[PDB]
Write a protein that binds this ligand. Structure first.
Ligand code: CL
Ligand code: CL
Lengths: 226, 226
């Protein structure tokens, strides 16, 4: 069975994880794990309570690892146990993936050095100090690394992984069974298409978080420099 | 505070619920409830464990009620306690909504009689015996009833509800904060765009479920006829 693992941490943005989970769990001969330091409840940033199924020590070797984003990324960027686990699994995984600010965790773990990558638009400046080549595209692939932007990035790239792990007809069948054909009623999902007034509001609301994450990023970069 | 409730039941398709939950939970002055017969664990069809936060008896009057779909819809269509709760909340709710096969639950509760509605493509024939006017569109609005198709229908219609409960700039800001701009890598999300061979496979895999749901639908229709 293909082994797929998602890191589940306090203050995760749960949709970053639950989207790809439901798609990939629809495939035959997959096993999906929700990984944290021990099994048990983990609370997402919205208050939704999710259950981790396996610990770092008991997790099998993964074929796919996926790091979601969320408020909780700041703590993960300085969690040596989590970063060590990610590095160990990435060494042999067929696919290393992240959604939104999850790529900052890959960066803190050293896995973006010299690699093309993206992250959430408001935090994109933090990729370069972590050694990445920043790219402003919604899905960026460099070798076996896939990084994507948007809360539903993992739904789309899960269909790509289904086609490469199985075949295109399997991916299309899953898409059809889920009737997945999005049609947003607004076109404000990028700073290049949203009204300027909306961009300003969103940037102002992210400013305190960005300031705190600049500090964390510099400390994480210092650890990589040693 | 605006009160938004999702029905959480065993064998739910969790993305039908977790998508709109994360969008709506991003809004100011909202309170979101996960409703079942009692608080506690509820297992989704994928095995993901979610927690219900409130019981039918303790749930406040809702401004928005949302019924997700999933395998578990068949049991809900004949659960008199759940159907009675839905009817009570729908009487005063500003918005009554469903995702995918959740509209079959609204149908069993009597809430689609004489109303335009949609559901998952493989189960669309079951709307007419429940009194609905079936429509083949991704989002169908009839008064305060919204029914949508696709596992991520509730993400899109949550942005519509944000614009009508608050204003368009608020909805656009949420879309931008989430960087929501989907771009599926295949175009097989509808039976009209997927290859014929894929449609056949999907229909064959749904056949046993459809047969069982034809039986349940007829019994539910008989209860409405009395
Ligand atoms: Cl997206
Ligand atoms: Cl969809």
């Amino acid at each position: 069975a293909v082994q797929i693992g998602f890191l589940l941490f306090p203050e995760v943005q749960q949709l970053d994880l639950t989207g790809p989970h439901d798609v990939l769990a629809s495939l035959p001969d997959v096993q999906v794990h929700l990984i944290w330091k021990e099994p048990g409840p983990v609370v997402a940033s919205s208050g939704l309570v999710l259950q981790a199924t396996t610990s770092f020590a008991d997790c099998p070797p993964l074929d796919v690892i996926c790091i979601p984003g969320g408020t909780g990324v700041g703590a993960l960027m300085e969690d040596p146990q989590a970063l060590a686990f990610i590095r160990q699994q990435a060494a042999r995984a067929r696919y290393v993936t992240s959604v939104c600010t999850g790529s900052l965790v890959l960066g803190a773990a050293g896995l973006l050095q010299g690699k093309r990558a993206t992250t959430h638009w408001a935090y994109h400046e933090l990729l370069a100090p972590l050694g990445a080549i920043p790219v402003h595209e919604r899905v960026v692939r460099d070798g076996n690394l896939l990084t994507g932007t948007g809360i539903t990035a993992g739904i789309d790239f899960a269909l790509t992984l289904a086609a490469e792990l199985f075949d295109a007809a399997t991916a299309q069948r899953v898409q059809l069974q889920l009737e997945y054909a999005p049609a947003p009623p607004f076109n404000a999902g990028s700073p290049d298409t949203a009204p300027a007034s909306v961009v300003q509001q969103a940037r102002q609301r992210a400013a305190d978080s960005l300031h705190k994450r600049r500090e964390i990023t510099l400390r994480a970069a210092a650890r990589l420099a040693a």
